[PDB]
């Protein structure tokens, strides 16, 4: 009578020991993940990235062609990874509209010097125009405080005077942020006019 | 007593792809760990995985 009751017992507790080794290994496991979600999330409460300063253009032949956008990282520092295949830039013009015009972030290494034709000419992208270049970096690919960044695009001819142009830039995790200007009435011969 | 399991990779592990570690005891559960690298990494030293 007692042999088989035992046999029950045993059964049932090796039956107990299975259950408690799958909770909590698949507990673990599940707060292990949460840990890591909320991380991720408090991760993209930062990294806003915003404009500092003023946009400036570039005119030639009384047309408007190349656009520089002055960005840096919000506070709370937690750089923006601006990788070629992590980030893209919208542009939207008034008769056209690109959904990727990134081609990559190129090292400031100040070039000749720090001027607008010098940064237009020097630096070329195989395909697409817009491109990032960062200043007082450290030769990374991600934008970080203490980072100066100036986005730069290689518009063929587009942008007369008075009509408007949109500028998006989606990175992988952040806001993205949106850009919209207008060309002014007075536009020189030649050299950058400053787009407010 | 405070443990710390090291691995050694040799040429693994480049930026954003995840990888998974398991321990098996003979006796208790199982533990899992699944980590991703960020996307900032030093040139040299310790960088926190979180």
Same mark, same amino acid.
């Given at each position: 009578?007692?042999?088989?009751?035992?046999?029950?017992?045993?059964?049932?507790?090796?039956?107990?020991?299975?259950?408690?080794?799958?909770?909590?290994?698949?507990?673990?496991?599940?707060?292990?993940?949460?840990?890591?979600?909320?991380?991720? &999330?408090?991760?993209?409460?930062? =990294?806003? #990235?915003?404009?500092?300063? $003023?946009? +400036? /253009?570039?005119? @030639?032949?009384?047309?408007?062609?190349?656009?520089?956008?002055?960005?840096?990282?919000?506070?709370?520092?937690?750089?923006?990874?601006?990788?070629?295949?992590?980030?893209?830039?919208?542009?939207?013009?008034?008769?056209?509209?690109?959904?990727?015009?990134?081609?990559?972030?190129?090292? &400031?290494?100040?070039?000749?010097? =720090?001027? #607008?034709?010098?940064?237009? $000419?020097? +630096? /070329?992208?195989? @395909?697409?125009?817009?491109?990032?270049?960062?200043?007082?970096?450290?030769?990374?690919?991600?934008?970080?405080?203490?980072?100066?960044?100036?986005?730069?695009?290689?518009?063929?001819?587009?942008?007369?005077?008075?009509?408007?142009?949109?500028?998006?830039?989606?990175?992988?995790?952040?806001?993205?942020?949106?850009?919209?200007?207008?060309?002014?009435?007075?536009?020189?011969?030649?050299?950058?006019?400053?787009?407010?």
């Amino acid at each position: 009578v007692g042999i088989e009751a035992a046999i029950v017992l045993i059964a049932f507790v090796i039956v107990a020991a299975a259950l408690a080794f799958v909770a909590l290994n698949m507990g673990l496991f599940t707060t292990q993940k949460s840990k890591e979600v909320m991380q991720r &999330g408090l991760e993209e409460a930062t =990294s806003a #990235l915003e404009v500092d300063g $003023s946009v +400036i /253009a570039n005119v @030639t032949s009384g047309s408007v062609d190349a656009i520089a956008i002055p960005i840096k990282v919000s506070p709370g520092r937690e750089g923006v990874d601006m990788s070629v295949d992590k980030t893209t830039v919208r542009v939207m013009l008034p008769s056209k509209f690109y959904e990727n015009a990134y081609c990559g972030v190129f090292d &400031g290494s100040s070039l000749s010097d =720090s001027k #607008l034709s010098t940064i237009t $000419s020097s +630096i /070329a992208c195989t @395909t697409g125009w817009a491109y990032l270049v960062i200043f007082n970096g450290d030769g990374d690919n991600v934008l970080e405080l203490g980072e100066k960044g100036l986005l730069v695009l290689e518009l063929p001819t587009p942008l007369n005077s008075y009509e408007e142009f949109k500028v998006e830039v989606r990175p992988v995790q952040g806001a993205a942020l949106t850009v919209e200007r207008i060309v002014p009435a007075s536009l020189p011969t030649g050299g950058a006019v400053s787009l407010g």
